[PDB]
């Protein structure tokens, strides 16, 4: 049944069609699921046995305990690092859904090598003073996990941790704290001055729709000023 189809994609690792397929062999409950967890790969196990858990809102006061902790973390590993918690959180929103952070190193460019060990020495800190419980997936570029705060417990909750090349950083920062409409509203302006600006970089783009090099971006400051707009602080980005 199609409610049974979009109530398994509320499972972390389970998609359309991953819940297409449970419901046509009889899964669709998270009991079901339960019953079943010969039928589940790693991240949708982690998502299940957290269900409950992921789907509750993250205060805001938790969200600074975590931010926090994470930063601390980090300083540790490398005073070098520069780690920003992005979405909601950073417009200093009263709750979030997840914790989504950017992380980025002076050695780490998009000309150097590749350098996944500058995520998985954060990754492995974090595991090791108990923040990070779980992992779902983890890669060379991308961390999807599970953390908790120090203890009655606090819920789990989903983190992301990204490492980004040190010049995409803060186009980074500007797309991933949105507002999804103030990206729009960004990226509109900004072609109206003759640049694009997306998830890694603002280039300008002619009058023949050519887009030139990259333009150096130190701060989320150096892309306002581009397209002459004035610097608009997070909690101000709603639109």
Known sequence: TSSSINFLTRVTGIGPSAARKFVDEGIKT????????????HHQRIGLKYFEDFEKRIPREE??????????????????????????FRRG??????????????????????????????????????????????????FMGVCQLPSKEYPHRRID?????????????????????????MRAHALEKGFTINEYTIRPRGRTGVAGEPLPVDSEQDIFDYIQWRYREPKDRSE
């Open 63 to 88: 969200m600074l305990q975590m931010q926090d902790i994470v930063l601390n973390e980090i300083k540790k590993v490398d005073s070098e690092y520069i780690a920003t918690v992005c979405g909601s």
């Open 161 to 185: 941790i990204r490492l980004i090349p040190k010049d995409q950083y803060y186009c980074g920062v500007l797309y991933f704290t949105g507002s999804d409409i103030f990206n729009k509203n």
């Open 93 to 142: 929103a009263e709750s979030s859904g997840d914790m989504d952070v950017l992380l980025t190193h002076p050695n780490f460019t998009s000309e150097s090598s590749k350098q996944p060990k500058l995520l998985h020495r954060v990754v492995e800190q974090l595991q090791k003073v108990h923040f990070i419980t779980d992992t779902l997936s983890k890669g060379e570029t991308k």
């Open 30 to 41: 998270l009991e079901d699921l339960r019953k079943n967890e010969d039928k589940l790969n």
